[PDB]
Structure 1
Amino acid sequence: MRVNITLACTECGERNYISKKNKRNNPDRVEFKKYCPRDKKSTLHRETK
């Protein structure tokens, strides 16, 4: 129901962040602009499948 997720940067693919979401409230792959340490800038991170 509420599960752990990992957000991968959409530029370099790196799984930079882990978080949780409630699957019933947010069933779709979440996206968040977060700092990617590899790219040294804020980039869109999308939940991995």
Structure 2
Amino acid sequence: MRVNITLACTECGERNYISKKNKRNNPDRVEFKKYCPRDKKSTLHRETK
């Protein structure tokens, strides 16, 4: 079913974002371009493994 996830700035490694997805719908690690406030710019933030 739908699960908690963490996205993490693929640059600095900063665990920047919790959210939710459906795993059956979305089974492969989702990625989004959301602001890292360590880097102070938009970066790709990927679901933590």
- TM-score category (smaller protein): over 0.9
CA RMSD of aligned residues (A): 0.3
Which runs of no fewer than 5 residues in structure 2 stay unpaired? none
Structure 2: distance between partners of 1:6 and 1:31: 10
Structure 1 residue ranges, 4+ long, deviating more than 2 angstroms after superposition: none
Larger strand fraction of residues: 1
TM-score with structure 1 length normalisation?
A: 0.98
TM-score normalised over the length of structure 2: 0.98
Distance, in Å, in 2 between the alignment partners of 1:35 and 1:8 is: 10
- Structure 1 unaligned residues grouped into runs of 5+: none
